[PDB]
mmCIF file of C-alpha atoms in Angstrom:
data_model
loop_
_atom_site.group_PDB
_atom_site.id
_atom_site.type_symbol
_atom_site.label_atom_id
_atom_site.label_comp_id
_atom_site.label_asym_id
_atom_site.label_seq_id
_atom_site.Cartn_x
_atom_site.Cartn_y
_atom_site.Cartn_z
ATOM 1 C CA UNK Y 46 16.886 -5.517 -15.650
ATOM 2 C CA UNK Y 47 14.285 -3.292 -13.807
ATOM 3 C CA UNK Y 48 10.869 -4.977 -13.259
ATOM 4 C CA UNK Y 49 7.985 -3.595 -15.311
ATOM 5 C CA UNK Y 50 5.182 -1.739 -13.529
ATOM 6 C CA UNK Y 51 2.142 -3.831 -12.599
ATOM 7 C CA UNK Y 52 -1.192 -3.043 -10.920
ATOM 8 C CA UNK Y 53 0.221 -4.303 -7.587
ATOM 9 C CA UNK Y 54 2.931 -3.046 -5.276
ATOM 10 C CA UNK Y 55 4.458 -3.452 -1.840
ATOM 11 C CA UNK Y 56 5.437 -0.419 0.199
ATOM 12 C CA UNK Y 57 8.106 -0.657 2.904
ATOM 13 C CA UNK Y 58 8.958 1.444 5.961
ATOM 14 C CA UNK Y 59 5.357 2.643 6.421
ATOM 15 C CA UNK Y 60 5.362 1.786 10.164
ATOM 16 C CA UNK Y 61 7.364 -0.181 12.732
ATOM 17 C CA UNK Y 62 5.354 -2.686 14.773
ATOM 18 C CA UNK Y 63 7.950 -2.547 17.567
ATOM 19 C CA UNK Y 64 7.195 1.070 18.212
ATOM 20 C CA UNK Y 65 3.644 1.844 16.956
ATOM 21 C CA UNK Y 66 1.831 3.370 19.915
ATOM 22 C CA UNK Y 67 -1.505 4.833 18.771
ATOM 23 C CA UNK Y 68 -4.663 2.775 19.135
ATOM 24 C CA UNK Y 69 -6.048 2.288 15.632
ATOM 25 C CA UNK Y 70 -2.735 3.147 13.927
ATOM 26 C CA UNK Y 71 -3.091 0.632 11.116
ATOM 27 C CA UNK Y 72 -6.553 1.900 10.135
ATOM 28 C CA UNK Y 73 -5.124 5.408 9.990
ATOM 29 C CA UNK Y 74 -2.421 4.150 7.574
ATOM 30 C CA UNK Y 75 -5.127 2.483 5.434
ATOM 31 C CA UNK Y 76 -7.156 5.670 5.223
ATOM 32 C CA UNK Y 77 -4.091 7.803 4.525
ATOM 33 C CA UNK Y 78 -2.924 5.568 1.661
ATOM 34 C CA UNK Y 79 -6.408 5.445 0.159
ATOM 35 C CA UNK Y 80 -6.585 9.255 0.392
ATOM 36 C CA UNK Y 81 -3.274 9.574 -1.433
ATOM 37 C CA UNK Y 82 -4.374 7.116 -4.130
ATOM 38 C CA UNK Y 83 -7.600 9.105 -4.484
ATOM 39 C CA UNK Y 84 -5.600 12.140 -5.620
ATOM 40 C CA UNK Y 85 -4.199 9.926 -8.418
ATOM 41 C CA UNK Y 86 -5.815 6.823 -9.935
ATOM 42 C CA UNK Y 87 -7.494 5.199 -6.948
ATOM 43 C CA UNK Y 88 -7.084 1.798 -5.370
ATOM 44 C CA UNK Y 89 -9.023 -1.494 -5.431
ATOM 45 C CA UNK Y 90 -7.262 -3.486 -2.657
ATOM 46 C CA UNK Y 91 -5.090 -2.552 0.290
ATOM 47 C CA UNK Y 92 -3.643 -4.442 3.255
ATOM 48 C CA UNK Y 93 -1.598 -2.935 6.079
ATOM 49 C CA UNK Y 94 0.312 -5.973 7.454
ATOM 50 C CA UNK Y 95 0.493 -5.271 11.211
ATOM 51 C CA UNK Y 96 2.934 -8.170 11.671
ATOM 52 C CA UNK Y 97 5.519 -6.875 9.153
ATOM 53 C CA UNK Y 98 8.907 -6.012 10.660
ATOM 54 C CA UNK Y 99 9.637 -3.959 7.528
ATOM 55 C CA UNK Y 100 6.425 -1.947 7.687
ATOM 56 C CA UNK Y 101 4.812 -3.388 4.568
ATOM 57 C CA UNK Y 102 1.585 -2.198 2.960
ATOM 58 C CA UNK Y 103 0.205 -4.006 -0.088
ATOM 59 C CA UNK Y 104 -1.760 -2.111 -2.726
ATOM 60 C CA UNK Y 105 -3.557 -3.013 -5.957
ATOM 61 C CA UNK Y 106 -4.684 -0.195 -8.228
ATOM 62 C CA UNK Y 107 -7.273 -0.366 -11.023
ATOM 63 C CA UNK Y 108 -4.677 -0.152 -13.799
ATOM 64 C CA UNK Y 109 -0.945 -0.023 -14.293
ATOM 65 C CA UNK Y 110 -1.225 3.713 -15.044
ATOM 66 C CA UNK Y 111 -2.956 4.177 -11.686
ATOM 67 C CA UNK Y 112 -0.292 2.125 -9.879
ATOM 68 C CA UNK Y 113 2.522 4.160 -11.414
ATOM 69 C CA UNK Y 114 0.857 7.371 -10.244
ATOM 70 C CA UNK Y 115 0.378 6.025 -6.689
ATOM 71 C CA UNK Y 116 3.900 4.621 -6.430
ATOM 72 C CA UNK Y 117 5.418 7.854 -7.679
ATOM 73 C CA UNK Y 118 3.345 9.801 -5.125
ATOM 74 C CA UNK Y 119 4.164 7.504 -2.151
ATOM 75 C CA UNK Y 120 7.794 6.619 -2.736
ATOM 76 C CA UNK Y 121 8.737 10.224 -1.915
ATOM 77 C CA UNK Y 122 7.910 9.966 1.802
ATOM 78 C CA UNK Y 123 10.131 9.714 4.862
ATOM 79 C CA UNK Y 124 9.344 8.376 8.338
ATOM 80 C CA UNK Y 125 11.639 7.920 11.406
ATOM 81 C CA UNK Y 126 14.833 8.314 9.406
ATOM 82 C CA UNK Y 127 13.903 5.961 6.536
ATOM 83 C CA UNK Y 128 12.530 6.494 3.101
ATOM 84 C CA UNK Y 129 9.332 4.752 2.043
ATOM 85 C CA UNK Y 130 10.111 2.440 -0.831
ATOM 86 C CA UNK Y 131 7.933 0.586 -3.318
ATOM 87 C CA UNK Y 132 8.365 -2.608 -5.326
ATOM 88 C CA UNK Y 133 5.997 -3.801 -8.015
ATOM 89 C CA UNK Y 134 4.607 -7.279 -7.399
ATOM 90 C CA UNK Y 135 3.684 -9.694 -10.216
ATOM 91 C CA UNK Y 136 -0.051 -10.266 -10.492
ATOM 92 C CA UNK Y 137 0.109 -14.009 -9.808
ATOM 93 C CA UNK Y 138 2.171 -13.453 -6.656
ATOM 94 C CA UNK Y 139 -0.147 -10.738 -5.374
ATOM 95 C CA UNK Y 140 -3.225 -12.795 -6.135
ATOM 96 C CA UNK Y 141 -1.803 -15.836 -4.308
ATOM 97 C CA UNK Y 142 -1.375 -13.736 -1.182
ATOM 98 C CA UNK Y 143 -4.646 -11.819 -1.573
ATOM 99 C CA UNK Y 144 -7.161 -13.956 -3.454
ATOM 100 C CA UNK Y 145 -9.877 -11.327 -2.768
ATOM 101 C CA UNK Y 146 -7.968 -8.849 -4.891
ATOM 102 C CA UNK Y 147 -8.171 -10.854 -8.109
ATOM 103 C CA UNK Y 148 -11.737 -9.861 -9.045
ATOM 104 C CA UNK Y 149 -11.838 -6.532 -7.256
ATOM 105 C CA UNK Y 150 -13.162 -3.637 -9.240
ATOM 106 C CA UNK Y 151 -14.713 -1.095 -6.907
ATOM 107 C CA UNK Y 152 -12.558 1.879 -6.124
ATOM 108 C CA UNK Y 153 -12.046 2.165 -2.363
ATOM 109 C CA UNK Y 154 -12.683 5.269 -0.239
ATOM 110 C CA UNK Y 155 -11.400 6.147 3.232
ATOM 111 C CA UNK Y 156 -13.585 5.701 6.282
ATOM 112 C CA UNK Y 157 -12.667 9.013 7.855
ATOM 113 C CA UNK Y 158 -14.264 12.130 6.384
#
């Protein structure tokens, strides 16, 4: 049975720490994902996990409707011969990893203009 959408998701294949070469690369990913969410339903928490062999980025959106829109917008991308994939994460699991995300409400904006 396919998991229900939630506010929270994990992207994969967004980067490869073995090969990332640009100074500031993970901030650029953060800004890019926020920009994409800000053509949909926005975003209230994001973490680009530099350590992740799988290239994981964690996102929480302000509602399930917003998460669906972001997932459907992001899970179409390709990088370095792999598709970006998304998996919804249960709220309690996401909140255990990112306690700061539990009470988040402010929609995020990119740093770059």
